[PDB]
Design an enzyme around this catalytic site. Structure first.
Site, PDB file in Angstrom:
ATOM      1  N   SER B 199      58.872  64.798  26.601  1.00 59.63           N
ATOM      2  CA  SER B 199      59.649  65.996  26.983  1.00 59.63           C
ATOM      3  C   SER B 199      58.736  67.017  27.637  1.00 59.63           C
ATOM      4  O   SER B 199      58.121  66.714  28.660  1.00 59.63           O
ATOM      5  CB  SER B 199      60.433  66.481  25.759  1.00 59.63           C
ATOM      6  OG  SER B 199      61.274  67.600  26.057  1.00 59.63           O
ATOM      7  N   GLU B 325      69.550  60.523  27.816  1.00 57.85           N
ATOM      8  CA  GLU B 325      68.721  61.734  27.797  1.00 57.85           C
ATOM      9  C   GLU B 325      69.514  63.032  27.568  1.00 57.85           C
ATOM     10  O   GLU B 325      68.977  64.000  27.026  1.00 57.85           O
ATOM     11  CB  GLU B 325      67.945  61.851  29.115  1.00 57.85           C
ATOM     12  CG  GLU B 325      66.964  60.715  29.384  1.00 57.85           C
ATOM     13  CD  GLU B 325      65.612  60.907  28.716  1.00 57.85           C
ATOM     14  OE1 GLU B 325      64.603  60.422  29.278  1.00 57.85           O
ATOM     15  OE2 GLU B 325      65.546  61.530  27.633  1.00 57.85           O
ATOM     16  N   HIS B 439      67.440  61.217  23.743  1.00 56.99           N
ATOM     17  CA  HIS B 439      66.165  61.819  24.137  1.00 56.99           C
ATOM     18  C   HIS B 439      65.132  61.857  22.998  1.00 56.99           C
ATOM     19  O   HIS B 439      65.444  62.275  21.881  1.00 56.99           O
ATOM     20  CB  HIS B 439      66.426  63.236  24.648  1.00 56.99           C
ATOM     21  CG  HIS B 439      65.207  63.926  25.167  1.00 56.99           C
ATOM     22  ND1 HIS B 439      64.615  63.592  26.366  1.00 56.99           N
ATOM     23  CD2 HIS B 439      64.470  64.935  24.652  1.00 56.99           C
ATOM     24  CE1 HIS B 439      63.564  64.364  26.565  1.00 56.99           C
ATOM     25  NE2 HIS B 439      63.457  65.190  25.541  1.00 56.99           N
TER      26      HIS B 439
END
Ligand SMILES: *[C@@H]1O[C@H](CO)[C@@H](O[C@@H]2O[C@H](CO)[C@@H](O)[C@H](O)[C@H]2NC(C)=O)[C@H](O)[C@H]1NC(C)=O
Ligand SMILES: *[C@@H]1O[C@H](CO)[C@@H](O[C@@H]2O[C@H](CO)[C@@H](O)[C@H](O)[C@H]2NC(C)=O)[C@H](O)[C@H]1NC(C)=O
Ligand SMILES: *[C@@H]1O[C@H](CO)[C@@H](O)[C@H](O)[C@H]1NC(C)=O
Ligand SMILES: *[C@@H]1O[C@H](CO)[C@@H](O)[C@H](O)[C@H]1NC(C)=O
Ligand SMILES: [Co+2]
Ligand SMILES: [Co+2]
Lengths: 538, 538
Positions: B199, B325, B439
């Site tokens: 991330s 995601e 995610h």
């Protein structure tokens, strides 16, 4: 007479003839049956009159004259181009019907009626690709075909009585009336007439479903790569009036919208060959100078409004497209790019210019939407994919998606629909191997051309013709192409339902059931791009 | 000392501790090594100073304090959310490094340096999901990690020397300089420092390749669900001032742009928890209040311009994405719809409303393009398909497509890139079934959490963890995840080349190699929509 060959039609007696099919199974044929008055002299451009009754016995043993039309000489004597060129003398006296019945002669057999295609500028029932002997004998149906007036001679419009428009469609209509009156005498059933056609012939079939004058003249419909909502299928009364004046201007006639009697008078006086030769001016891809029009009698509204409101014949449909529809039209158009030769490709710069030329009526922001939708993003600058992008944009816009609209609008009104995707290259195909499954390739197999062994078709191609010929005839009989008891040789063709949008792939070694075909690309053309033009116009 | 647990660093001596990795295998750890002066009082918001040298031997055995941030308590005590919340006490004094070496102790082994992610507003190295013991012990590498300042404390900008921006990245920069000067004493090679993050941690890692200051402090980079050209990665130095003045306004300080010294002084006086808990005013989906900025020292141009010019580190890259995601950010933001429960779905009108709230900056002609590109034309009004469409539009725009662009530009500047697509669900995943492979789901498997016997991971999941831990460590060691000799159990990971764009699917029972992924959907956001907005917007 005790002789079966002689048949007492409503206007007189006709003598047919027994002919061998290429399969070795004999059939009775009647070729060149006069169904209407020869539209000559003052009758040119007008709707047809029924044929004057005759005294004695007329021999219907010879294929009739084809209608006056231009001849495809751009590639010379190229067998793929010349197979559509007319194989009988060009004459205004072209309004004839051909009937072919199997042996022994049936009682009340299903009638399959072929209406030819040639963008409403060309074509004829007498071509060898449309041979009835295979389809009649192998499937036990009365195969019928008709000639209708084509080009300006069948579709000139000035908004006047003397050039009322749709004369080619009324030719087809009068033939449908004839079949209803007379086809029972040849072994047919009037109540089981199935209309089947390709391209403009398939468009014609769709207009017969919509139209009121032909609503009670047939039963079912097959539509090979065509529909009434196509961009080229119809033309407006405003544009149709102007093109007739352009024709008059180009031929050397009075060409003013103020006094329209003077234009038609001399136009009728001109030679029909010079008339058709001076039709083609400045036109884009897949748009034809003289095509059907919303006249008032045959059609009294645009086919979209009929389709939107639901005003069409409540009957079964079998329809479909091919994988490479566009290429044929981008071969004849875009001549410098896309030459008729082996291993041609399109560079990204050449592709970028083609979207301007192939879509000349769109702003620019719309042209950006076209380059995004039709790009292979796995390899953006691929010379083979860029060539393919041109085929698809033309093929989707002008054929595939318009079949889908028509088929989907039939589905969500209750009627059973059966969609196909034809995905087969003939082994000895004269066109380049990059051209793929072109527009009109299906015709060779629905008419049983592989069953003629003097052509070098393979064994699997012969089995594949027999396969699709059954689906076609099974559908014309009972309204379902599927067999009564399912087979491995004859896979399941599921219904193209509204919620499911299924289709059967038609190829050698497959029975793949997809969904669409190509729903995202059609959603682009029919939903996205229309509102994008509406947004960016102001 | 000949005692191996002690190490004389450049600012003093430290004593580590021998502990068991969850598996059973044994490691040396050094926890809470200071690398900076505590950024306390005058030094708040400013870049870090190096640590003052200490006397004797510092017991570097307890995990360090997490930096000041918010605690996720919207779902309360949901295990899937609380695993990302800090597990050590919050403190401004948080600038520490963790070192974990495998036994037997290596000499010049590859260093795998972890930078965590939390939208630059959250996170800590001490989380049990980032457990270094397993990774280090299983692959024989020196796993290092660091604590960098997050939120406004880490990334406040007023365009002044007292609030210059990017303090968090300068923390990381100083931390990288520590590892370069010291890691040979722990058994690691300073020349084989491989950065890896997820991330915002991958964003951080990506900016280190771009940055002039950290260019010569590491070798290779691994980037999970992150890229420097992501819309949330940076904000403008124009905006970031306004963000700070709105933060000053919320807490009750002077917010006059004419006088910035009074703002930064007052802000330095307030409690650190007050600051972090009054940042979130009215900010949309996937856009965080205090993040990186183009300053002049760390970065003197936007990441897009540096990619345009090829101004970045010439080395290998191992990057990728997951399939889902977006959902994670569509759960927290937009919580009235799509709530945390099994079998939720989104109707067509709810999707049509969602696209407005997930993209509120676009002009409406652009909304039509997004709905078109993210609707299933197979079944447009499917509630399941309309839900997944929301996951993708957010997952593509914010994550997948920026990862692809970074990999692309690297690949076509002659660098060896390796792309992945993580497609695996944990069998005992506490999140809903519809969320799929969300995610940051891969972190547990890259750090060897399945090898923990107290947890209930399957034996297939244990193999899959050892599989990708090998790829990662092989890349870190050699610049190629593929093993030498090419084992059968380890499939071929082909290079993500500029022409082909190959990616490996990382799942349990698949070695599928595709293209992209989602190149068509990424051409939408990067190629088509930008030139649409410019065409439409006046
Ligand atoms: C075809 O029409 C022609 C003229 O309209 C006829 O041809 C003749 O008919 C018989 C047929 O066995 C034969 O005498 C000759 O072939 C032709 N002779 C004459 C004098 O015309 C005939 O009526 C039609 N064809 C057939 C087979 O009856
Ligand atoms: C941690 O620091 C302490 C204090 O500097 C080290 O020394 C210990 O000090 C205590 C007094 O609280 C004594 O009772 C012990 O005898 C000392 N321990 C040893 C091992 O000498 C201590 O050494 C450090 N921790 C470790 C694990 O070495
Ligand atoms: C084509 O037919 C063969 C058997 O004749 C068989 O492999 C399969 O049905 C088809 N081939 C494929 C799918 O590769
Ligand atoms: C992977 O799936 C295939 C399905 O063809 C199956 O045969 C195989 O057993 C699966 N692999 C494992 C390890 O179970
Ligand atoms: Co004139
Ligand atoms: Co104020």
């Amino acid at each position: 007479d005790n002789d079966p060959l002689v048949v007492n039609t409503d206007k007189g007696r006709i003598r047919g003839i027994t002919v061998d099919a290429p399969s070795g199974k004999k059939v009775d044929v009647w070729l060149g049956i006069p169904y209407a008055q020869p539209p000559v002299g003052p009758l040119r451009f007008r709707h047809p009159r029924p044929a004057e009754k005759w005294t004695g016995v007329l021999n219907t043993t010879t294929p009739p004259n084809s209608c006056v039309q231009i001849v495809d000489t751009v590639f010379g004597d190229f067998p793929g181009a010349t197979m559509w060129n007319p194989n009988t003398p060009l004459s205004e006296d072209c309004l004839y019907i051909n009937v072919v019945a199997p042996r022994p002669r049936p009682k009340n057999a299903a009638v399959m009626l072929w209406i030819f295609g040639g963008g409403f500028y060309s074509g004829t029932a007498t071509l060898d690709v449309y041979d009835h002997r295979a389809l009649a004998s192998e499937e036990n149906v009365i195969v019928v075909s008709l000639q209708y007036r084509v080009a300006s001679l069948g579709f000139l419009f000035l908004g006047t009585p003397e050039a009322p428009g749709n004369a080619g469609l009324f030719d087809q209509n009068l033939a449908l009336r004839w079949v209803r009156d007379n086809i029972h005498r040849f072994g047919g059933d009037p109540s089981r007439v199935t209309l089947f056609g390709e391209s403009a012939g398939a468009v014609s079939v769709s207009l017969h479903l919509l139209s009121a004058l032909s609503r009670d003249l047939f039963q079912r419909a097959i539509l090979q790569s065509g529909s009434p909502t196509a961009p080229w299928a119809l033309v407006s009364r405003e544009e149709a009036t102007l093109r007739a004046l352009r024709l008059a201007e180009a031929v050397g006639c009075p060409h003013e919208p103020s006094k329209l009697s003077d234009a038609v008078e001399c136009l009728r006086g001109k030679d029909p060959h010079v008339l058709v030769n001076n039709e083609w001016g400045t036109l884009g891809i897949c748009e034809f100078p003289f095509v059907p029009v919303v006249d008032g009698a045959f059609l009294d509204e645009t086919p979209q409004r009929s389709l939107a409101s639901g005003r069409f014949k409540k009957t079964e449909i079998l329809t479909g497209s091919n994988t490479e529809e566009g290429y044929y039209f981008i071969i004849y158009y875009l001549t410098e790019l896309l030459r008729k030769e082996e291993g041609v490709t399109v560079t990204r710069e050449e592709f970028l210019q083609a979207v301007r030329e192939l879509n000349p009526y769109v702003n620019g922001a719309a042209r950006q939407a076209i380059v995004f939708e039709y790009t292979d993003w796995t390899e953006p600058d691929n010379p083979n994919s860029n060539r393919d992008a041109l085929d698809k944009m033309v093929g989707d816009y002008h054929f595939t998606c318009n079949v889908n609209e028509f088929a989907q609008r039939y589905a969500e009104e209750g009627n059973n629909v059966y969609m196909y995707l034809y995905t087969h290259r003939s082994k000895g195909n004269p066109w380049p191997r990059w051209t793929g499954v072109m527009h009109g390739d299906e015709i060779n197999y629905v008419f049983g051309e592989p069953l003629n062994p003097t052509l070098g078709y393979t064994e699997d191609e012969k089995d594949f013709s027999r396969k699709i010929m059954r689906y076609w005839s099974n559908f014309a009989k009972t309204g379902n192409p599927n067999p009564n008891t399912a087979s491995s040789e004859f896979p399941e063709w599921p219904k193209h339902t509204a919620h499911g949008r299924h289709y059967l792939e038609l190829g050698l070694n497959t029975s793949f059931v997809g969904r669409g075909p190509r729903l995202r690309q059609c959603a682009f053309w029919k939903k996205y791009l229309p509102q994008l033009v509406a947004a960016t116009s102001n």
